[PDB]
Design a protein around this ligand. Sequence first.
Ligand SMILES: O=S(=O)(c1ccccc1)c1cn([C@H]2[C@@H](O)[C@@H](CO)O[C@@H](S[C@@H]3O[C@H](CO)[C@@H](O)[C@H](O)[C@H]3O)[C@@H]2O)nn1
Ligand SMILES: [Mg+2]
Length: 138
Amino acid sequence: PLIVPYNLPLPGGVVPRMLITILGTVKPNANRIALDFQRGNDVAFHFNPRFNENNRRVIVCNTKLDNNWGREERQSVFPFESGKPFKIQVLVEPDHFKVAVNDAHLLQYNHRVKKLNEISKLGISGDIDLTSASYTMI
Ligand SMILES: O=S(=O)(c1ccccc1)c1cn([C@H]2[C@@H](O)[C@@H](CO)O[C@@H](S[C@@H]3O[C@H](CO)[C@@H](O)[C@H](O)[C@H]3O)[C@@H]2O)nn1
Ligand SMILES: [Mg+2]
């Protein structure tokens, strides 16, 4: 078990066919989780499950450039549950990130930040017990 917030180095950034796996358990009374694929201070891909935005559960995705959030993309399919173990897999493809949770496709996020080999850190934060974070080439 790792302490959050956690930084996973991504030296050489990301590349198509790279699969990033995040394993953890949602805390009781969770409010939010965040994955931040970073290029320096910019956030190429922010993946933000919100457990209680107006008594609604929603996943918010966005990009932060020069400290300004862009236009959100939202997903109401919500596979995470307080108290339960999860696996997030982020598959890098040429035109988008493809996200699966617990082996089920969840969403895609088109690349806004185009320099993938400079997205050199993944930050993992929020209301989880983080077991592990790693990647491979499939
Ligand atoms: O790491 S965190 O989870 C996090 C860290 C510490 C405590 C809690 C969470 C975390 C989330 N955030 C951001 C990020 O999620 C961003 C994505 O678009 O959304 C904004 S809220 C956004 O505000 C708009 C007005 O400007 C409003 O128009 C819009 O409707 C509404 O969605 C978030 O504040 N930064 N850090
Ligand atoms: Mg497409």
